């Protein structure tokens, strides 16, 4: 697989810190990764969170980085949900572009305990 | 907004030719677009169908181009489901990439009658 992620199923309580990982294997100095999010409930378009690379990090306009941040270390990309909100529940995943193809990591689901 | 799509809800019968459209709105520059798909059931990662641009079109490895194809005409991008199958039901959308940011169109749902 192109990506290796941290456990795909996560339970978090309100206010907890959640840390997600996607490793892009077989990488180079140009390797970049974008964190995306999809809401629970009805199917709806993904939301861009941030783009990470050695030379440039770019967060989405309107992203509150006090609650959601991320970083690159070597070939690992991380997303941190600092103070888990009810509306932070959903599906997080990485996206990587190579030769005109968009690649996606498996979903990492993060939900409150039922 | 950045995208305009054909009707977001489509009802189709088996064997019907279904044609979807996403228009990239403020084309200041040259535009490109990738057609993506999400399965209707359990939430899981989107599937890349094809990338469309002036200088390169790229279909996903494995894509049956006899059932699914697409093209670019100026800032309009189209996806054609040539002979609608049960397995073609689901959610279709576009993304484009600009200045390290991924943008997505609204979802277009295509389903058989109840």
Numbering used by the authors:
A (entry chain A), B (entry chain B): 1 to 114
What did the published study say regarding this structure?
Here, we report the high-resolution crystal structures of chicken, swine and bovine CD8α and confirm that they are capable of forming homodimers. All of them are CD8αα homodimers, and each CD8α exhibited a typical IgV architecture consisting of two anti-parallel sheets. Our results suggest that although CD8α and MHC I sequences change drastically during co-evolution, a few conserved key residues ensure that the CD8α forms dimers and interacts with p/MHC I during at least the co-evolution of endotherm species.
Three extracellular Ig-like domains of chicken, swine and bovine CD8α (cCD8α, sCD8α and bCD8α) were crystallized and diffracted to 2.0 Å, 1.8 Å and 1.8 Å, respectively. The sheets of CD8α are composed of 10 β strands, but there are 11 β strands in sCD8α and bCD8α because their A and G strands are divided into two separate parts. The buried surface areas (BSAs) of cCD8αα, sCD8αα, bCD8αα, mouse CD8αα (mCD8αα), rhesus macaque CD8αα (rCD8αα) and human CD8αα (hCD8αα) are 828.3 Å2, 979.6 Å2, 928.7 Å2, 1048.7 Å2, 1105.5 Å2 and 1026.3 Å2, respectively, indicating that they are tightly binding dimers. The BSAs of sCD8αα and bCD8αα are similar, but there are six hydrogen bonds in sCD8αα and only two hydrogen bonds in bCD8αα, indicating that CD8α dimerization does not mainly rely on hydrogen bonds. These four aromatic residues can interact with each other; for example, F48 contacts F104 in sCD8αα as well as in other CD8αα. The numbers of residues composing the cCD8αα, sCD8αα and bCD8αα cavities are 7, 7 and 9, and their volumes are 202.0 Å3, 322.9 Å3 and 384.6 Å3, respectively.
